[PDB]
Design a protein around this ligand. Structure first.
Ligand code: ZN
Ligand code: ZN
Lengths: 89, 89
């Protein structure tokens, strides 16, 4: 899926990272050094996530729980406990 | 100090746990299975704490920060970041 200034301005599904080349992913090429948006580095200082705080990203191997907190592991990342960037599932 | 039904009906200092014997603490006999009030099990799902949500407990090894949130580690528990149930170094 395309996204970003190169892809047309779409947002990635499950709010994944849009690389600078305009493609969606969740690995370093997309989320680290060559990320354009919803980058690992864009996680709020307070680590909250969700619609309440405008759907910000979470860092590497961290997901946005359904309670609105970024963090890692099943409790944040496994289905129904996870709202986006889910990665455990 | 004394708290709860056996101890006067007060809340502990630093909103710590009141055991079933009416004494204040922060270890498992106080906060765990034999806890009467402000127990580890009473953390709100939304993780809020502070007086605007009526001084809820925080879970185990979590502290209420000055920002109104329960969580683990130095953002919530360290000296100047913590308002109650503070414990980290
Ligand atoms: Zn939670
Ligand atoms: Zn932090």
């Amino acid at each position: 899926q395309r996204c970003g200034s190169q892809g047309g301005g779409g947002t990635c599904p499950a709010l994944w990272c849009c690389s600078i080349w305009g493609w969606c992913g969740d690995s370093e090429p997309y989320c680290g050094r060559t990320c354009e948006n919803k980058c690992w580095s864009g996680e709020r200082s307070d680590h909250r996530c969700g619609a309440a705080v405008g759907n910000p990203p979470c860092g590497q191997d961290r997901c946005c729980s359904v309670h609105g907190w970024c963090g890692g592991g099943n409790d944040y990342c496994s289905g129904s406990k996870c709202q986006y960037r889910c990665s455990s599932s």
